[PDB]
Each structure stands twice: as C-alpha cells, then as structure tokens.
Amino acid sequence: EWMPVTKLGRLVKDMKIKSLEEIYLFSLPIKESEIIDFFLGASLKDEVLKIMPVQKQTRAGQRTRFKAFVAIGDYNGHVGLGVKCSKEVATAIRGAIILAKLSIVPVRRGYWGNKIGKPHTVPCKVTGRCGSVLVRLIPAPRGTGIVSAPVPKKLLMMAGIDDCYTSARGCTATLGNFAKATFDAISKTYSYLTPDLWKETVFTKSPYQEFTDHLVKT
Amino acid sequence: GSLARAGKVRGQTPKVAKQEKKKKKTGRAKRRMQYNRRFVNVVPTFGKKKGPNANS
C-alpha cells in the first residue's frame, strides 16, 4: 500500500485532487512517484535510453558506477526524463524510473496549419539547451512524423507528439545532454506565451487552500 | 617479415563438407515465413530478451 508523506500526496490519495493538471497549475513539486502512478500509472511506458559506466579513480583501481537514463511518458501529452547513478545497474534503472516519474511535465501540442481534429505537433518553434547541445523543435504538417535523431524521437513519441521537425547542434553524442535538451524543449511548450493564451488568468483555489479542512482534521 | 606462412590457417583447418539441406523459399514466400515467425505466433514473449539466433 501507499502511505503518503506530504500534503500533496495525502490530498491525491484521498481523491481530493482531480487531475495531475491541478498540480501543474500551481507549479507544485511532486516528491512522491505514487502520485504519478495514481494519475497516469495505467498508461505510462518507460524506456532505458542508456546505461553509462562512469568511473572514479581511487587509490586501488577504478570505482565503477552505472548511470541509467530513463524516459517515461504516456503517449498523450506527458513525458519525463530521469537519470540515476548507482552501484548496480538494476538499482540505477529503478531509481531512474522513479526520477523520470517525478519529473513528468505537461506537453502542449498544436497545429501546423489548419486546426481540424486533435493537435498533432508542437505549438511553435521551441528550443532546449543542455551543455552545448541545442535541440530545436519545429511544427510539422500532418502525417510528417518525427524528423529527428533516435533519442529525441523516443522522447517526442513518448510525449504524444505526432509530427515534428528537429534541428540539433553541439555534441549530441552526449546522450544525456541530448535527452535533457529535448526534454527542456518539450517542457518549454507550455511556458511559451501565444496569443491564444493572452486571456486574463482567473485564479482558482489552491489544493492546499481548498482542502485545508481535510488536512487539519486528518 | 617472412612470407612462408601464407595460407597457413586456411590450409591447416579440417575441411568440413556443407551439409545437405532442403532449399529455402524465395521472394514473397520467404517474406511470408519471416512475417509468420516475427509476428503471428510468438509464445516465449514474457518480458525477456530473445534473439532469432540465440544459442542459449
């Protein structure tokens, strides 16, 4: 069973927070992966992008740790990327799955031209950066697919993006920086102010304010 | 260096004749056989790594 250790975890467990988007609305940190299991656990799929052996030089030989990169996400507009370093590979993979779940961000999807049906591509050109690696996502027409390298393609397919153009600069052989730059670009989709988002923000009650009585009485 | 050993390993390996086996299908039939193997009936799929030429 799951016993929460935070106010957000308790509110989610008690069926008081309706969706993950109510947590995203208030930019609240998610510190328990069981919340993500509660909301998207029936559709989350994780892929191990890389196992990377890192070494620390010691007095007697080389200490070796394993760094697992795990991309998670339902194919319907949520994606996360987690990196975990551990003594053993299996522990690294488990921890990286947990960290990917904890880092899951909402993905905004738009239209390239005319707006028939559901959104298929990125709402506009976005760019993510990580250590000299620059990843640019460009809206693509319907049926284009993802014109990208395999790692950004995995991340973008896991984010529910159907059509995309990709441009990469830097040392994309650094799979970690490539993955983090793609994740950053995908994250910037909902932080980009477009004219359809100009309407004045109407504030609603926070989860920590709406269900204060439940937290106190518990 | 010396050129004396030229067909050393190729000449010194025991000559083993190719076994007689029935011809493989070609064209659309070979692709049909491949499709059946990969996609139609697959039992050992239980979350483990299996290769088409696994010797273990």
Partner: peptide, 27 residues
C-alpha cells in the same frame, strides 16, 4: 529484468563484450 546482462556488465564494465551488454540493456 535481464539480470544476466547486467551482471555480465558489472563483471567487466570496459570488457571486450562491454559494448554488446550495454546495447542489450538499452531499450
């Protein structure tokens, strides 16, 4: 979990078969 490939990797992180095991674990 393919504990075989992971354990063979921990046997030799930089071994002759290290790239094959690393590729096997990826996916």
């Amino acid at each position: 979990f393919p504990y075989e490939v992971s354990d063979a990797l921990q046997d030799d992180p930089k071994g002759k078969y290290s790239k094959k095991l690393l590729n096997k674990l990826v996916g």
